[PDB]
Amino acid sequence: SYYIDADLLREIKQHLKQQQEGLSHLISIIKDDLEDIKLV
Amino acid sequence: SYYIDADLLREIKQHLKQQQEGLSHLISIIKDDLEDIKLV
Amino acid sequence: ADYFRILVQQFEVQLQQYRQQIEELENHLATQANNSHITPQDLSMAMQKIYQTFVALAAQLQSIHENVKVLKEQYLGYRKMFLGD
Amino acid sequence: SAPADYFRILVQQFEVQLQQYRQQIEELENHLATQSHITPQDLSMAMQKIYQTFVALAAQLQSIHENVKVLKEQYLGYRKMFLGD
């Protein structure tokens, strides 16, 4: 067997997840920019 | 006076608008990937 | 297969095609006298400049996807280490 | 514009978060009971590179944002020219 603390791994995972969400929020703003730009 | 054909300008704009949507599609895939991936 | 790269290549082909469709429309532009000395040729150049930005944007999106791919591999690598392989 | 200001604020806040979380995760790691042949230092190095990928991605997205601003400027430049100004 090989025992590991899943609570600890999950804590690390949650930190990274929040950073992923941050990047995703930036993308959202760029998508809004692309929708709004008009040649005329 | 300076007369221009607005229908012509609209034909051009429609092409560029599609390209903007194409960029948005691509970056949306990137967003979807960042929302889906997980450390575990 | 790398389907993201496939989608970018298709976008890049669309750029080429739409540029050419606009080039056909540029034959319909008319030269009139103006303070700025603008001609259809100037407009064509300004349009191509816009296309070069689209080219840059698509390539940059591909480069971001490549880093998302790296991130996925790094996550899997760390997971394997943490879980004792 | 509000979106452009908010983007800038989000990037600054993201950088702060990266710094903070980097330390919080590093402290979680040195408290790992291991050995298999994976040392806490192996995990730490791997995590460091993950952090580097996040920093890269944020910078790349900022550049995309800036290039979309350029695209808009070029649109406006073209429109102005098309309208004889």
From Swiss-Prot, chains A, B:
The record lists the membrane-crossing segments as none
What does the PTM comment state? O-glycosylated.
Task: Write out the annotated subcellular location.
Answer: Nucleus, Nuclear pore complex; Nucleus membrane
Q: Which family does it belong to?
A: Belongs to the NUP54 family.
What does the record say about domains? Answer: Contains FG repeats.
Disease connection: Dystonia 37, early-onset, with striatal lesions: A form of dystonia, a disorder defined by the presence of sustained involuntary muscle contraction, often leading to abnormal postures. DYT37 is an autosomal recessive form characterized by the onset of progressive dystonia, dysphagia, and choreoathetosis in the first months or years of life. Affected individuals show delayed motor development and may have impaired intellectual development.
Q: How does it assemble?
A: Component of the p62 complex, a complex composed of NUP62, NUP54, and the isoform p58 and isoform p45 of NUP58. Interacts with NUTF2.
Query: What task does this protein carry out?
Result: Component of the nuclear pore complex, a complex required for the trafficking across the nuclear membrane.
What is the name listed in the Swiss-Prot or TrEMBL entry for this protein?
Answer: Nucleoporin p54
Per the UniProt record, the source organism is Homo sapiens (Human)
Q: Which gene encodes it?
A: NUP54
From Swiss-Prot, chain C:
Q: What else is known?
A: In rat, the p62 complex contains two different isoforms of NUP58. Isoform p45 has however not been isolated in human so far.
Entry text on domains: Contains FG repeats. FG repeats are interaction sites for karyopherins (importins, exportins) and form probably an affinity gradient, guiding the transport proteins unidirectionally with their cargo through the NPC. FG repeat regions are highly flexible and lack ordered secondary structure. The overall conservation of FG repeats regarding exact sequence, spacing, and repeat unit length is limited.
What protein name is recorded for this chain?
A: Nucleoporin p58/p45
Record's subunit section = Component of the p62 complex, a complex at least composed of NUP62, NUP54, and NUP58. Interacts with NUTF2. Interacts with SRP1-alpha and Importin p97 proteins when they are together, but not with SRP1-alpha protein alone.
Q: How is it modified after translation?
A: O-glycosylated.
The gene that this protein is the product of is: NUP58
Q: Tell me, what does this protein do in biology?
A: Component of the nuclear pore complex, a complex required for the trafficking across the nuclear membrane.
Q: Which family does it belong to?
A: Belongs to the NUP58 family.
| Cellular localisation | Nucleus, Nuclear pore complex; Nucleus membrane
Task: State the taxonomy lineage.
Answer: Eukaryota, Metazoa, Chordata, Craniata, Vertebrata
From Swiss-Prot, chain D:
Its subcellular locations are: Nucleus, Nuclear pore complex; Nucleus membrane
For this chain, the Swiss-Prot or TrEMBL PTM comment says: O-glycosylated.
**Whom does it interact with, and what assembly results?**
Component of the p62 complex, a complex at least composed of NUP62, NUP54, and NUP58. Interacts with NUTF2. Interacts with SRP1-alpha and Importin p97 proteins when they are together, but not with SRP1-alpha protein alone.
- Outline what the protein does: Component of the nuclear pore complex, a complex required for the trafficking across the nuclear membrane.
Similarity comment: family membership:
Belongs to the NUP58 family.
* Miscellaneous comment: In rat, the p62 complex contains two different isoforms of NUP58. Isoform p45 has however not been isolated in human so far.
- Domain topic, free-text comment: Contains FG repeats. FG repeats are interaction sites for karyopherins (importins, exportins) and form probably an affinity gradient, guiding the transport proteins unidirectionally with their cargo through the NPC. FG repeat regions are highly flexible and lack ordered secondary structure. The overall conservation of FG repeats regarding exact sequence, spacing, and repeat unit length is limited.
Protein name (database record): Nucleoporin p58/p45
Q: Which organism is it from?
A: Homo sapiens
Q: Which gene encodes it?
A: NUP58
